[PDB]
Amino acid sequence: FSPRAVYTSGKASSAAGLTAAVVRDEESHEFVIEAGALMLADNGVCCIDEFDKMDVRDQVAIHEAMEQQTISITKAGVKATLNARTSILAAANPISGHYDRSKSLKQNINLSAPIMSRFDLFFILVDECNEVTDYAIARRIVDLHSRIEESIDRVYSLDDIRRYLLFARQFKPKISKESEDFIVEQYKHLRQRDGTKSSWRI
Amino acid sequence: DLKGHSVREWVSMAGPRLEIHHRFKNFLRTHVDSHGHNVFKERISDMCKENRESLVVNYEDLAAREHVLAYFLPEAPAELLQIFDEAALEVVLAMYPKYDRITNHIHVRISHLPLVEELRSLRQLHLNQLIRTSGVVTSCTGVLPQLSMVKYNCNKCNFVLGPFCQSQNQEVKPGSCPECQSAGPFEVNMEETIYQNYQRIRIQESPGKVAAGRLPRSKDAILLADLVDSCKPGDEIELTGIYHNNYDGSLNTANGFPVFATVILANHVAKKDELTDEDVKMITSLSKDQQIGEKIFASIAPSIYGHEDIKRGLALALFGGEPKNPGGKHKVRGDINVLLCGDPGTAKSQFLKYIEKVSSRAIFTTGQGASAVGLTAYVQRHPVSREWTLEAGALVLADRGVCLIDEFDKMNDQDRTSIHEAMEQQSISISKAGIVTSLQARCTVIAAANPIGGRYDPSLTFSENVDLTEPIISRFDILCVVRDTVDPVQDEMLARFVVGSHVRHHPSNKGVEPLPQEVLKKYIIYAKERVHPKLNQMDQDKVAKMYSDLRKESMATGSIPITVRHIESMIRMAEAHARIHLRDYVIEDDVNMAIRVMLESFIDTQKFSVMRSMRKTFARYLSFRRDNNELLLFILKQLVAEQVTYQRN
DNA sequence: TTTTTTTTTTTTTTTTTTTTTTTTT
DNA sequence: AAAAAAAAAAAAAAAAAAAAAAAAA
Ligand SMILES: Nc1ncnc2c1ncn2[C@@H]1O[C@H](COP(=O)(O)OP(=O)(O)OP(=O)(O)O)[C@@H](O)[C@H]1O
Numbered sequence A: 001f002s003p004r005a006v007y008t009s010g011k012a013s014s015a016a017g018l019t020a021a022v023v024r025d026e027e028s029h030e031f032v033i034e035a036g037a038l039m040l041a042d043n044g045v046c047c048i049d050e051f052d053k054m055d056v057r058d059q060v061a062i063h064e065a066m067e068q069q070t071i072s073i074t075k076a077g078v079k080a081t082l083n084a085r086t087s088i089l090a091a092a093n094p095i096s097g098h099y100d101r102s103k104s105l106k107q108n109i110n111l112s113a114p115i116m117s118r119f120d121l122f123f124i125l126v127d128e129c130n131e132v133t134d135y136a137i138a139r140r141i142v143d144l145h146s147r148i149e150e151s152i153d154r155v156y157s158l159d160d161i162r163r164y165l166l167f168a169r170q171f172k173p174k175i176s177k178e179s180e181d182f183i184v185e186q187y188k189h190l191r192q193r194d195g196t197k198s199s200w201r202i
Numbered sequence B: 001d002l003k004g005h006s007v008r009e010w011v012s013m014a015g016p017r018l019e020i021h022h023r024f025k026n027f028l029r030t031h032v033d034s035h036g037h038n039v040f041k042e043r044i045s046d047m048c049k050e051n052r053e054s055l056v057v058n059y060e061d062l063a064a065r066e067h068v069l070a071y072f073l074p075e076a077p078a079e080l081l082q083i084f085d086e087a088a089l090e091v092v093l094a095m096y097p098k099y100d101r102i103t104n105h106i107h108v109r110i111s112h113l114p115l116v117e118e119l120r121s122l123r124q125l126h127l128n129q130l131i132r133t134s135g136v137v138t139s140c141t142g143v144l145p146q147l148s149m150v151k152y153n154c155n156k157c158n159f160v161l162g163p164f165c166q167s168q169n170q171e172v173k174p175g176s177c178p179e180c181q182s183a184g185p186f187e188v189n190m191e192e193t194i195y196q197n198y199q200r201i202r203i204q205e206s207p208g209k210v211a212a213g214r215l216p217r218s219k220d221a222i223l224l225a226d227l228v229d230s231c232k233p234g235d236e237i238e239l240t241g242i243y244h245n246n247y248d249g250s251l252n253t254a255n256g257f258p259v260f261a262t263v264i265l266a267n268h269v270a271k272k273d274e275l276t277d278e279d280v281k282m283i284t285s286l287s288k289d290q291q292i293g294e295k296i297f298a299s300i301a302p303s304i305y306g307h308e309d310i311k312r313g314l315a316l317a318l319f320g321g322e323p324k325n326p327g328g329k330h331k332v333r334g335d336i337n338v339l340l341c342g343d344p345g346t347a348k349s350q351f352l353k354y355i356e357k358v359s360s361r362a363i364f365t366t367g368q369g370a371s372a373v374g375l376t377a378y379v380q381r382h383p384v385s386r387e388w389t390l391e392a393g394a395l396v397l398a399d400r401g402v403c404l405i406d407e408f409d410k411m412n413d414q415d416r417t418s419i420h421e422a423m424e425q426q427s428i429s430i431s432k433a434g435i436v437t438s439l440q441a442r443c444t445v446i447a448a449a450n451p452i453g454g455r456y457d458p459s460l461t462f463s464e465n466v467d468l469t470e471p472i473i474s475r476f477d478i479l480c481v482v483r484d485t486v487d488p489v490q491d492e493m494l495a496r497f498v499v500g501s502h503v504r505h506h507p508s509n510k511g512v513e514p515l516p517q518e519v520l521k522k523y524i525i526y527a528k529e530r531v532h533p534k535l536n537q538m539d540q541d542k543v544a545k546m547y548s549d550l551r552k553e554s555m556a557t558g559s560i561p562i563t564v565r566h567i568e569s570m571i572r573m574a575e576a577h578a579r580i581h582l583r584d585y586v587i588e589d590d591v592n593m594a595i596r597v598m599l600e601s602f603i604d605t606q607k608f609s610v611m612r613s614m615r616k617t618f619a620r621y622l623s624f625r626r627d628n629n630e631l632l633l634f635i636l637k638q639l640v641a642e643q644v645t646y647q648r649n
Numbered sequence C: 001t002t003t004t005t006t007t008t009t010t011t012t013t014t015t016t017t018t019t020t021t022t023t024t025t
Numbered sequence D: 001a002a003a004a005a006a007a008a009a010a011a012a013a014a015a016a017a018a019a020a021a022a023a024a025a
């Protein structure tokens, strides 16, 4: 859906191809920069499937990108500080292949603490073996596979949503005093939540 | 004077050439100011006085007084600028006839050019024109000596040949020597030749200016004989220069298209961004405030709320102690290393970054490899310079400054060994390729770390809930245990702080008084460089009794004991606190404050039960300069928290 | 005959992959 | 005892600096 959206895998991407690389221009004395997956997601999204499987040598780069939004390269006779303003949608399998509900999120996955720290949202999708949910899922899947082109009545076409997203991204909302007080109270309550235990501290 | 067929050819003619020459001379003489009568008078005076051999000329005034010359300028920069140099030389001689002995030449630099472009907007249309751009210097070579006025030496008849002025476009080829009429090889004659400094830099688009789906572009520039060393890598610079193209650049080589490389002949450089006098009065003026200690302790990382004790420790680390080596066989470091161990989300990295920002010769590195410079030394060919250099470890780079180490508990084995060596012996020993050397790194290490398991548990002593061996922790003078404990009042206050910061830094809108940061660093410089307190007034009786009591108490329980190095650290912190006040003699209150800080750290390093044991046993020491309100508020908060826990269980 | 552009060669370094080794359950 | 992560080996590719030879006029 999203333009400037780049999808990758766990171990299928190396460091250079995932962040950046440098080659020398074949026609002059200057050097050109091969843009890695992170860069192509600039002002977009990077979808890292099987994140937990990614090598540490690459996870350090992803952590750097999340930290300062930028990639610093000193290679092949050229230095550069390039911009990577990308959001990261990661998909990580729980350690052991199944999510264990009797542990904190820190233990259920093999992500380093710095990586998890700067993830704004963690969504846990446990496969509760409920019959109603299974019936609904089966109905939807079979309806999809029976009626391929139809059966999808989306109120807004993907092109319309793309245009609306591109227009709305330009807005820079303010924070009024009332909203500031509401944020303060909500944060107070959310911290009080952590006073049973939660999947991870707040 | 719009007339003719070609602008460059128009200036080429002798007539308009001399017309422009004399008009520019008259402009230099006559253009005075709105009120600064004859700015160029004092300009030339100062330049000659310091022997600067340069003249920065604003474009606005030149266009105002002589619009024709300003219009001609960008179209054919080479000829107009050469004429301006010729004019300014004789103008200077008229003002300073003797100065003719100095450089026999004057360069004219032009600034505030009206139209400013970006490296991505450069096109063939801009060839051979004065253009103003902005960018980050991404690489810069040494000050290479380039031939200026060569005198080749004929081999056959050993006759030196006349000066063949070197051109930036083509290499000079000598003819046949006038004497023996030989077209032989010839060789430079360095003793009789004269050169000019030649630096080559690369300027790339500022990342903050690049668009979303685009990559920064870069252009090569040449600085010549006076702009050299005016830039360093990482500088944001406005560069005005000639988009020169015709030197040798044409891909006539096979498997190549008729492309042309481009380099900007630099003509003016402006960096967009501390040895003063009479500021000693300023520093001394508030030095006698009698409460400056609180001011400075509150003037550290003003963007961080609370954590006052950590700020005090960082202030003491900044001002440092007094290194002393009795005889030459007992090396005692004057530094105050600090370790901030705490659960995440408590602004430890913020403190480290503030110290990076506020302290000169301060470098930042991380336990991970995400830092520009590593902790360990090595030797290699630098990737950008391609030159074989000894990359000294980060600690060495901060030889007399501050090394900030984030993720202190995620280092490598070799990184741990290197930090141990630096902290222990204050030097690094390298034997990597053939360099058997020992270079000293007298750095103050300020480290940040998280407890094992991501949460600090007071039921366990400090040394066991941190992924650091005892020898490493034993070399830190202050241990700050930052704990994130749920507290509604503090939570609300911090929420207000950060949300207000977010409000105030929106793009559209872009109990003492803390000192301004610039004055704070001036004070730090003066204190750290001039005042060297001596502890001739320390009460040995009090310190000895305190140490003996602490030994007895710590050994009375199964707790980490107090050792001599703790007394050493207390001495260093007392000297640092005296340095803050520039007393030049440690006073009883300085010693008491140092004892307070050292005991606070040592107590907080203990387990939960021993924490209260030593708090009650030494509450007198730990309460120095701690007014009644603070203790009463702490006790009330403890009681109300106990009530809350009883309520919600 | 004399220049010039290429040809090599001779070092050195750098990067990817694979393999080998070390640490943990 | 066996798997996961790290380190080292090793082989292939690139830069490049300089000396010598073949082709051109
Ligand atoms: N006392 C504080 N005052 C102001 N801002 C704070 C404070 N504590 C935390 N913050 C803010 O909360 C965020 C978290 O802080 P920060 O990113 O520096 O974490 P940290 O202590 O370095 O954690 P970690 O150990 O995970 O690296 C930042 O945006 C920081 O500005």
Ligand SMILES: [Mg+2]
Pocket (backbone or CB within 6 Å): B348, B349, B406, B407, B448
């Ligand atoms: Mg941190």
Ligand SMILES: [Zn+2]
Pocket (backbone or CB within 6 Å): B154, B155, B156, B157, B158, B159, B177, B178, B179, B180, B181, B182
């Ligand atoms: Zn001769």
